[PDB]
């Protein structure tokens, strides 16, 4: 009756939940990078002249 903490996983559904938890984190990291890039482009366009 060891009942290891990480034993109630179900591989496929576990990966589905991994995509549900942290997948949105990856999405928002990509969004943050894109927003930073857009801000840098705006600053470059303004300072260009």
């Amino acid at each position: 009756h060891a009942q290891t903490f990480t034993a109630a996983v179900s591989k496929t559904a576990w990966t589905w939940l991994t995509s549900l938890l942290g997948g949105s984190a990856v999405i928002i990291i990509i969004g943050l990078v894109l927003a930073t890039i857009v801000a840098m482009y705006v600053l470059t366009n303004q300072k260009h002249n």
């Binding site: 366009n45 303004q46 300072k47 260009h48 002249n49």
Partner: protein, 162 residues
């Protein structure tokens, strides 16, 4: 020249921003749409123009609004040809050098925001928003537009809202 500049500014519909009977700034119509410095509070001195709803642009502390085409009939003419030299505006001449506009000390103060800068042909080349004490002269914080249509705001370090 200054006489002709004032005559052109008056004939073209330009109206100061009145608040409690005090002139706190100026606003003008260029390219057929009204612009107003956001930091200046009050309403344009024109009931017809005051009916227009403005949009805010915090980044440049400026506002803009759509002007009816019939009133777009006669507005300021903008140009992108901004060579080095001297230009004219309401309070006299302005020196343009190194990409910056400078005027002699004692010219310009709180309440002059919104005065455009005109070339020899009477075309707008920049809009005065503020300034900072620069000894024998003062450097104005202005916005200018290149031939590619890029809005560039030149702001001296620690510039005061004039």
């Amino acid at each position: 020249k200054r006489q002709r500049m004032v005559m052109k500014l008056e004939s073209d519909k330009t109206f100061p921003i009145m608040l409690e009977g005090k002139i706190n700034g100026y606003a003008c119509v260029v390219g057929g749409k009204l612009f107003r410095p956001m930091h200046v509070e009050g309403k344009i001195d024109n009931d017809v123009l005051a009916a227009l709803k403005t949009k805010k642009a915090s980044k440049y502390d400026l506002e803009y609004a759509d002007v009816p085409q019939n009133m777009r009939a006669d507005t300021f003419k903008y140009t992108h040809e901004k060579p080095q030299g001297y230009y004219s505006w309401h309070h006299g001449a302005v020196q343009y050098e190194n990409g910056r506009f400078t005027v002699p000390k004692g010219v310009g103060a709180k309440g002059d925001s919104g005065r455009p800068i005109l070339d020899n042909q009477g075309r707008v080349v920049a809009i005065v928003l503020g300034g900072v004490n620069e000894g024998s002269r003062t450097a104005l914080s202005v916005v200018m537009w290149n031939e590619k249509g890029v809005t560039v705001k030149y702001t001296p370090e620690n510039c005061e809202q004039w």
